[PDB]
Paper text:
The NSP15 endoribonuclease enzyme, known as NendoU, is highly conserved and plays a critical role in the ability of the virus to evade the immune system. NendoU is a three-domain 34 kDa protein that was demonstrated to form a barrel-shaped hexamer in solution by the assembly of two trimers. The oligomerization is mostly driven by the contacts of the N-terminal (ND) and the middle (MD) domains, while the C-terminal domain (CD) carries the canonical catalytic residues from the endonuclease family. In terms of substrate specificity, NendoU of the coronaviruses is described to cleave a great variety of single- and double-stranded RNAs in an Mn2+-dependent reaction, by hydrolyzing the 3′ end of pyrimidines, with a strong preference for uracil, and to release 2′,3′-cyclic phosphate and 5′-hydroxyl ends as products.
Here we report the results obtained during the fragment screening campaign against NSP15 NendoU. For the fragment screening campaign, the chosen crystal system was obtained in a citrate condition and hexagonal space group P63, containing two NSP15 monomers in the asymmetric unit arranged in a dihedral symmetry, which can be symmetrically expanded to reveal the full hexameric form of NendoU inside the crystal lattice. Over 1200 crystals were soaked with different fragment compounds or nucleoside analogs, resulting in 997 datasets collected and processed, with an average resolution of 2.2 Å. Despite the high concentration of ligands used for soaking (100 mM), as well as the large amount and high quality of crystallographic data, only 26 crystal complexes of fragments or nucleosides (2.5%) with NendoU were obtained, highlighting the difficulties in identifying fragments for this crystal system, probably related to the large solvent content in the crystal unit cell (74%). Unfortunately, the NendoU active site, which would be a primary target for the development of a competitive inhibitor, was occupied by a citrate molecule that originated from the crystallization condition in all refined datasets, which resulted in a small number of binders to this site.
Author numbering:
A (entry chain A), B (entry chain A), C (entry chain A), D (entry chain B), E (entry chain B): -1 to 346
The structure:
């Protein structure tokens, strides 16, 4: 017996939908859900989605509260829909997926992923839930996560981090590193060898290697000397050039982190979604150097160094393809006289 | 001559409603009030309430700008309505009470609290306003605050802190510690002996006793030794256990404050109102330990220590009732072999 | 071929309107613009203006992304409208001006500023754009900025700072200090000699003179002694008096900055627009001292000292007029026995 | 080059989307689309759909303006989606189908019905459009209408009436009677024998047989005698019984039409959609006789008489199934002593 | 003392704004204004304009309640703004003009039409209001109506009809036929000779000449014979041709009125504004004959006959220009062998 008032009862009493019986009085006004506590209205939910307020409220209440893959990983693997859960996208304040399976009468296209409507969709399955590995084996199209071996299925070791109630973290009390599997058109697909983005924020950035500690602590010239980076244009690509009206380079999050400690800047996140590569309109507060589309990726600096040192430096310009978060990220590499001029995630 | 434009004139010229004459041009669009300053619209108010935008604007403009009791105290004393003022609830961005007396033509049930409609309501009276102690004596149901003695009325000394324009503070330039009195059904009611919550935030938490300084400065084992807390399960209740998927204990704000200095965590305030006990959906960023309903109370640690050491430790489970902010807070106490296992504000 | 979908294409691909060809799918719901990225809606813009959502979106996308004068300067110079650009007011999240010239089919009153409808409007012209100095010479009413000499036009050297994508800054990689010129009724107007406000925030306040370093570092009595300020009431005007229920003085931002480092306070910006003088409803957290209308100006302390020491101290009360940001700011000066009692921006 | 402004231009200049180049200025406010005509706003569209206002506007503009099957026919034949058109549902003021093919970038799941996502969907094909008969021949699942014979397919002769811009009519200047063909999983179906509803209104009801002429002109007793309808309870079922608090019978639109000529009544259309059977909350103004759910069907009276005279009258109650508008309509037939008591579309 | 509550008081007590003192309690929710009557909310106004709800409410309340020129007349004469009144546009449910003079603080650009901002605007002046003839005499740009002669100005005799509270009528108890005068750049214009539209409705159409009486009463062939209209294609242009899928002709309202008596049709008013020529998407219910853009004008039939009989019938196609309601209306005239084929208001 699903009901708005039952969803609200669960949110008030359990902090999320927990299948408990009960009802509280609700008022809906515009995109806000309220409940009456002792004669006054208390806000339970503000709809930021393109769904109806009461529907969004239910999907949010029914959000997966276990560690789940970051939405950028799901998107990069082509996930269309989840089996019997909601992956809440905390970057969009909205469901990661438009439709559901066995969650909500307004958004369900099916009660179970075995229904024929689901066959052409890439369904996300969670091996931590009884039955879902089997549903994956039966599905035409899917992505599966597990905490361990699945007999006969060749695994891909995923990122260390996952999202737990919108907090990206490397679990200590809980497991966040999953095996991944994918099927297309009834056929298990070998996932590519990949780097993973580190999913750090500017404000709480922490180095995760001696090389990153050195980059944050050393001055530019000593770091470049110590790690033999002469001719790799880290002065432009990583450290950034704030000397002209157009901000030069600055494509690695650690480089933004180092600048940020010294002087503040504005990052306008003009397409605010989770993605392997982020684009910001950056305005440097100290200098007034700015750039409308500054592509930024959070690679471990050691991974970026491995990538750039792996490149042939003998052509003027070429597209370099690097597998990151399971997706092919195109970089533009510009060279002159066997040194790098710039290397950036290629703007589409 | 009350008018939207007159309310707006007061907000622009006086920073709140101050009974001054004058008008400014206003535009209302959706839930926002704007005024025209030199040919452009400037936002004066965004309605977050369930009232009409123009009505909410007026109540907010007419908010009490003296120190007033925190809404949790008023709610715990059963206050329904205020005499000739608006207690603005800065935690809900809304009026603390649905109706008014002598404030606003849309929300007034009466011009004066002596009207018979008010008799069954618990009316909040403010002895700092001429006439209101007398109105309390005449009222069937009420709560009264004063800065001093009321002849023949036995006082209750309230919390040290009050709310001044949404800032909870212990007044130095102004008095925030009131005498409280309550009447039910025409009869003055003896208020119970009570502890008071300290109303601190995680971000700006300051200790208020040598014991709290010690808790914040010492390591866990030395604090527990120094204050003879062996067998009282402070390791679970106060310090918190982040070792399992479900976060253990962590029910005292000071304990959250100590953790917060070391590593960040998310507190989802899923019923965002003022209350003696708060419930959060907590996600620890470092460990991934989490709990959907983590009850948190900000007691002076000395008061909590007094409370828990006062308990008989010889039953498995029992409900312990403690008067806090004038209300009966139920705690669950779980013991084994004469030591505490856990002691938490009982989830309803 | 202007279109909502073309505006959205530019925002997604270029971070702002850049005249590029292309379209993306858009959804408008309430005041929010979304675009479809891989089957889900991503928010591009939330309308906070009194214009239609799609119109506001276009003006914002077409915002000037060069350093431009702070809106308070434009307003103080009487600017009504801009030639062929949008000055976005980041303090109001709205266009600085109601109408446009050659920007947007819904808001344009003209395609070019030479149209007769523009003659009575003070049009903002930007000498960094080809043709606009000539348009200024032809305009009946206008304000012109340039980076250099305009033959025969007597310049006014403007503030050091300008606004670049809502960041107020003194440019190092870009020029933010302009020459200003104004015309009224076909006649070039001599701009007055003026001080300029420094446009600092409380949170990131930095001193810009030895005197400001001294004010922030010294104790009150040594600062006043060192700078010979006995009898100028800096104890009240600058440092502020938190000893009574009404907060005394505190009219200079540097004084708020010094207090802020010690103890937090609330500033309610109840008319949130850019202005030379700002009015706050201030609540001091430590003391409970408050003031409904606290006028605050960010003058270099040396400029304020020059201003107050320039005054005749022999009348009880008088209005003192000071040109600041090109506008006449009225101050009330109250004296007793040849010493200052108070000196504040006069509340209108 | 698809664009809100281009859709608006077509609506203003062509009365609907007609693929013309051009732009008009548009404003969107709440669910309304306006265009500027000589400096004032003129309403073009009010969104009554659950889609975004600008999307609904485009699908409306792109509505099919030829006679098309009534939505109830399409729904009954299981049509999911239309090939390269929008069937506008004028009963719901909304698109008949969730998704589109080759119409609108926000709603399209495909550009052509040959794409694999369309294979499981019952696609509507219109033989009046070049290529669509052949697309039906290649489609796995579809419904096809034609004005004439299709080589190698036996037709089902459809209703005489079709919908032209929300006007249901029997064409004299245009053809409204289609051949129907349907395919499920690649197999041409033999559509069942069916009656058709007549799609008439109460206010402009016209008889379409001599029996209907006689029913409207004669008194009940004369009509029942002429057509030998003794014992078939037409007094109840068709004429209606307004003698008790609950209105008896009245399940045939012609009987509502007859009452309506004599005295008015209220029909609350509480599920306002196109359906073979309609349910109304009916209140008779003359008598006060009412019924919460009065099922009403517009059958030619001769067809209804054929149906009721083709039943076995020997059981107290049973379900009678009748193919109408290609769907199975359940009636309840209640009999006593070999005569009808009532017969109504089953409220199930 | 202008105020939302005072406007509401006037609406409740005087049926419109009448300058009376008083206040009622108001609530604004979305675009609706309500007032409280004995504890319940009663709707006073639903905003259909692009202005803020409270502003639209005031301009509506302050509407001109005397007979005033139809908006199409004012628009055709180039009126920008009205002197000290609001011409309410009942076709758009919105003010006829963007701005006001001496009406409303939000919309006023001036208090008096003598202010310099009004000099370039064509201001509407009403000689029925003391002082306005003289204000017209002093105005650079205006239109003036009067009931009688103005010393030294030759009048243009206007239409017989005017709008009184959105009812277009020819006054018997009040004067609706005005003298018109217009000034451009300080010079009294000689207004052109003009026909006038008759502003009639389909539902209450009344003939205003013996020719119109005859057109309504006689069969097409008798009428055409009586008035010698052979070869002028009235069969097509006026009577309409419902024989083909595209509805032929039907451009004269009297011909729609005649059809409408026999059989109903749908007229979609897809640009719902007052204009000399109206465009309808017409669907004939009897035949299914339809046309996306059917231009319709309500000329006295005698005037239309004079116009068509005053053209040269010797070319295949040309533009015929006719002054109607003071504006230049373009018709397309198509001829063959010296007879008319069609003649219609040009869809341009």
């Amino acid at each position: 017996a699903m009901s708005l008032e039952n969803v609200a009862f669960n949110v008030v009493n359990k902090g999320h939908f927990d299948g408990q019986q009960g009802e509280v009085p609700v008022s809906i006004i515009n995109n806000t859900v309220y409940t009456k506590v002792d004669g006054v209205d208390v806000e339970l939910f503000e709809n930021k989605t393109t769904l109806p307020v009461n529907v969004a409220f239910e999907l949010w209440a029914k959000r997966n509260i276990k560690p789940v893959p970051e939405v950028k990983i799901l998107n990069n693997l082509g996930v269309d829909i989840a089996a019997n859960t909601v992956i809440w996208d905390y970057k969009r304040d909205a469901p990661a997926h438009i439709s559901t399976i066995g969650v909500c009468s307004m958004t369900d296209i099916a009660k179970k992923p075995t229904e024929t409507i689901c066959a052409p969709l890439t369904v996300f399955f969670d091996g931590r839930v009884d039955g879902q590995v089997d549903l994956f084996r039966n599905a035409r199209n899917g992505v599966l996560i597990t905490e361990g071996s699945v007999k006969g299925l060749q695994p891909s070791v995923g990122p260390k981090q996952a999202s737990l109630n919108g907090v990206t973290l490397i679990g200590e009390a809980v497991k966040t590193q999953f095996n991944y599997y994918k099927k297309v058109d009834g056929v298990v697909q070998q996932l590519p060898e990949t780097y993973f983005t580190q999913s750090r924020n500017l404000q709480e950035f922490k180095p995760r290697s001696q090389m990153e500690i050195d980059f944050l602590e050393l001055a530019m010239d000593e770091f470049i000397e110590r790690y033999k980076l002469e001719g790799y244009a880290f002065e432009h690509i990583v450290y950034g050039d704030f000397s002209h009206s157009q901000l030069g380079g600055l494509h690695l999050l650690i480089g933004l982190a180092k600048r940020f400690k010294e002087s503040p800047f504005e990052l306008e996140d003009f397409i605010p979604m989770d993605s392997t590569v982020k684009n910001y309109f950056i305005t440097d507060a100290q200098t007034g150097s700015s750039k409308c589309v500054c592509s930024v990726i959070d690679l471990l600096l050691d991974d970026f160094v491995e990538i750039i040192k792996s490149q042939d430096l003998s052509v003027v310009s070429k597209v370099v393809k690097v597998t990151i978060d399971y997706t092919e990220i195109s970089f533009m590499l510009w060279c002159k006289d066997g040194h790098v001029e710039t290397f950036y995630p290629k703007l589409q």
